[PDB]
Amino acid sequence: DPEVTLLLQCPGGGLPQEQIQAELSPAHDRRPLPGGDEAITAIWETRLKAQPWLFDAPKFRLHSATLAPIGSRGPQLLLRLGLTSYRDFLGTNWSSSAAWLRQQGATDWGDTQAYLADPLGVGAALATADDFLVFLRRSRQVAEAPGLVDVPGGHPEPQDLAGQLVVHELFSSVLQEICDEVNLPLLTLSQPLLLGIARNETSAGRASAEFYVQCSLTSEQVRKHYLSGGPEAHESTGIFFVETQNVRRLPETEMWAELCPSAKGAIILYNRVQGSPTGAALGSPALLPPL
Ligand SMILES: Cc1sc2ncnc(N(C)C)c2c1C
């Protein structure tokens, strides 16, 4: 799977909000482009003159994520974050010259990402009460990954002492994206656990935080809620469910070639962090069949 790389695998089956610190600093921002940020302004002007209803929005930038020594007390993860925008993304990661910017960043800064917007995404492995994961079909008319399978998620917009409010907005945003797109009541959802961070090598290395969320509704009840919104209540064109039993071998199925990179990252992290048992009971051959 060359189109996805794991930047972080969380310990303990995944980290709760109270175990994560953020450092939000202009030191974590994108570097100005070698020939100046005028190249970004030119791309944006061209795009607005074709689609004048488009609007910019601020985004969090991922710089890096450092895990504490395993089994330690105190905070277990430090997220180093900067600020970026939808405009900066379109002028860098989604530029035809994104690979040239990666080579230039390695040369100038020893950092393939130094000249890239790298907005932070969020995604969920969302499990039902009857042990299925939730999948969504992307419209064939959108610019990114048209017609591919996705999981719930989005790119959160900004509004340890500004730190804790930023971690709160990251965890909040994955629940809000489930309520907005799947049409589920907030009180049916567990507090999220962070599973890890995956990079999309087809989008010049932009990263998504991948979370596990449990719903108290069955697959049948989730479907009813999604469909009862009607076609204008969701960006996706359909919903479907795979038993958690069968998610274990999803990379060996024909579904795998239809999954967008960030959904592949969610499923790899679910399998490594929530699946893959370590104890004698769940690891016994009848409960963990070989092959
Ligand atoms: C990585 C991001 S941030 C962002 N903000 C607003 N719209 C977007 N779309 C739908 C193109 C994006 C994408 C793909």
UniProtKB/Swiss-Prot annotation:
Q: Under the cellular component aspect of Gene Ontology, which terms does the record hold? A: nucleoplasm
Ranges for region Disordered: 147-159
Q: Which domain of life is it from?
A: Eukaryota
Which InterPro entries does its entry note? Answer: NUDIX_hydrolase_dom, NUDT22/NUDT9-like
Indicate the impact reported for H155A: Abolishes enzyme activity with UDP-galactose
Q: Which UniProt keywords apply?
A: Hydrolase, Magnesium, Metal-binding
Q: What is the effect of changing E181A?
A: Abolishes enzyme activity with UDP-galactose
> Which residue positions does the secretion signal occupy?
none
UniProt binding sites for substrate: F55, Y86, R138, A143, D150, H155, E157, S262
Has the keyword Cell membrane been applied to this entry? no
| UniProt keyword Endoplasmic reticulum, yes or no | no
Cofactor entry: Mg(2+)
Tell me its family: Belongs to the Nudix hydrolase family.
Full protein name: Uridine diphosphate glucose pyrophosphatase NUDT22
Protein species of origin: Homo sapiens
